[PDB]
Design an enzyme around this catalytic site. Structure first.
Site, short mmCIF file in Angstrom:
data_model
loop_
_atom_site.label_atom_id
_atom_site.label_comp_id
_atom_site.label_asym_id
_atom_site.label_seq_id
_atom_site.Cartn_x
_atom_site.Cartn_y
_atom_site.Cartn_z
N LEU A 154 34.83 42.41 32.60
CA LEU A 154 36.12 42.49 33.31
C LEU A 154 36.35 41.35 34.28
O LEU A 154 37.50 40.96 34.47
CB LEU A 154 36.29 43.84 34.03
CG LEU A 154 36.42 45.10 33.16
CD1 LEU A 154 36.44 46.35 34.03
CD2 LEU A 154 37.65 45.06 32.25
N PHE A 171 29.26 37.24 44.06
CA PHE A 171 27.85 37.10 43.67
C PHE A 171 27.43 38.19 42.66
O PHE A 171 26.25 38.56 42.58
CB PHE A 171 26.93 37.05 44.92
CG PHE A 171 27.37 37.89 46.10
CD1 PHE A 171 28.30 37.40 47.02
CD2 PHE A 171 26.83 39.15 46.32
CE1 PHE A 171 28.72 38.18 48.10
CE2 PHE A 171 27.23 39.92 47.42
CZ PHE A 171 28.18 39.44 48.29
N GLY A 172 28.40 38.66 41.87
CA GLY A 172 28.20 39.70 40.87
C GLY A 172 29.16 39.68 39.70
O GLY A 172 29.76 38.64 39.39
N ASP A 200 39.73 38.33 51.41
CA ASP A 200 39.95 37.72 50.08
C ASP A 200 41.19 38.30 49.36
O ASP A 200 41.18 38.55 48.17
CB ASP A 200 38.65 37.92 49.25
CG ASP A 200 38.44 37.03 48.04
OD1 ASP A 200 37.53 37.33 47.25
OD2 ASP A 200 39.25 36.10 47.83
C1 LIG Z 1 37.41 42.22 38.80
O1 LIG Z 1 37.98 43.39 38.22
C2 LIG Z 1 37.86 44.57 38.90
C3 LIG Z 1 37.28 44.69 40.16
C4 LIG Z 1 37.13 45.95 40.76
C5 LIG Z 1 36.51 46.06 42.12
C6 LIG Z 1 37.03 46.94 43.08
C7 LIG Z 1 36.43 47.08 44.32
C8 LIG Z 1 35.31 46.33 44.64
O2 LIG Z 1 34.76 46.39 45.88
C9 LIG Z 1 34.78 45.45 43.70
C10 LIG Z 1 35.39 45.31 42.47
C11 LIG Z 1 37.55 47.08 40.09
C12 LIG Z 1 38.17 47.00 38.81
C13 LIG Z 1 38.75 48.07 38.07
N1 LIG Z 1 39.40 47.93 36.93
C14 LIG Z 1 39.52 46.65 36.45
N2 LIG Z 1 40.28 46.47 35.37
N3 LIG Z 1 38.99 45.55 37.02
C15 LIG Z 1 38.33 45.73 38.20
#
Ligand SMILES: COc1cc(-c2ccc(O)cc2)cc2cnc(N)nc12
Length: 292
Positions: free
Chosen positions: A16, A21-22, A137
């Site tokens: 996705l 850093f992940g 960010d």
């Molecule tokens: C980069 O894509 C996403 C990131 C996150 C997310 C949310 C909170 C957080 O602290 C870190 C990551 C959630 C996602 C959920 N659904 C899709 N499509 N994509 C996502």
């Protein structure tokens, strides 16, 4: 019980994103091995050092603490045996990032729709501020689309908690930083506050009304203004001098005057003069009401 997820039951479906850093993966939590399990978004660290794991656990606690219609929902955590690697389980927002969604559909998303998303982003940010969290960010790449009517803030990987006695958080040794969304005091003094998140919100408003036209992105435009010959640390030095002299991103083509006025107010060099998110959501909803 349902916030505790067994990793052996998590089936990888697709990638996705790769932000800080992940990485984020779409997985099916399938403890019945019949592919009838729930689809979730999973964040894991690509480099899970001691320092990174400590910051990631704080991000997890930040997300878990937030309950708002315009903030991605925390579902749970997956723990590994031994070294205690962590996975953050969240709801999967099927329409992907707002940046990709808008870049795909372009002007087929009308101004009324862009302002519905703008209001939702202000509301998520206003709620974040009540918890004394600083996102750091805010950008369309970090906003996710649930459906045509709802967006949510994601990627709390740079989020900081304000000290009890201060209205800003100073980052001592910064990592990768989205400088083209940074307030001048963030560039000069590494100071982050609700007001620097408001500055970033002005950049997000600019992104929406450019419809993610590549040549019009904040990095392309600021590099054009400082000169495309600038490189590495020189970019930051010249960007600071540009902002100090009121160099700003231009008005997007076809952007309504009232919306452009909001962007320019968010981009005030005077921290105290920037609007609040409470006022921004009120202002944006009134514009939506007048357009309707
Ligand atoms: C980069 O894509 C996403 C990131 C996150 C997310 C949310 C909170 C957080 O602290 C870190 C990551 C959630 C996602 C959920 N659904 C899709 N499509 N994509 C996502």
């Amino acid at each position: 019980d349902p916030t505790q997820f067994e990793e052996r039951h998590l089936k990888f479906l697709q990638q996705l994103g790769k932000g800080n850093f992940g990485s984020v993966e779409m997985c099916r939590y399938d403890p019945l091995q019949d592919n009838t399990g729930e689809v979730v978004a999973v964040k894991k660290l690509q480099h899970s050092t001691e320092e990174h794991l400590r910051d990631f656990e704080r991000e997890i606690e930040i997300l878990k603490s937030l309950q708002h219609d315009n903030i991605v929902k925390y579902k749970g955590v997956c723990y590994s045996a031994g070294r205690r690697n962590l996975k953050l389980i969240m709801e999967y927002l099927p329409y992907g990032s707002l940046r990709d969604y808008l870049q795909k559909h372009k002007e087929r998303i009308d101004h009324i729709k862009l302002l519905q998303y703008t209001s939702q982003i202000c509301k998520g940010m206003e709620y974040l501020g009540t918890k004394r969290y600083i996102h750091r960010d805010l950008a369309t790449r970090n906003i996710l689309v649930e459906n045509e009517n709802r967006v949510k803030i994601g990627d709390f990987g740079l989020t900081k908690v304000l000290p009890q006695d201060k209205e800003y958080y100073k980052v001592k040794e910064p990592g990768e930083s989205p400088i083209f969304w940074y307030a001048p005091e963030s560039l000069t003094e590494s100071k982050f506050s609700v007001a620097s998140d408001v500055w970033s919100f002005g950049v997000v408003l600019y992104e929406l009304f450019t419809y993610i036209e590549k040549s019009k992105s904040p990095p392309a435009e600021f590099m054009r203004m400082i000169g495309n010959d600038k490189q590495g640390q020189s970019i930051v030095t010249h960007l600071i001098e540009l902002l100090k002299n009121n160099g700003r991103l231009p008005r997007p083509d076809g952007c309504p005057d009232e919306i452009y006025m909001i962007m320019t107010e968010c981009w005030n060099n005077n921290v105290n003069q920037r609007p609040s998110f409470r006022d921004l959501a009120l202002r944006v909803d009134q514009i939506r009401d007048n357009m309707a």
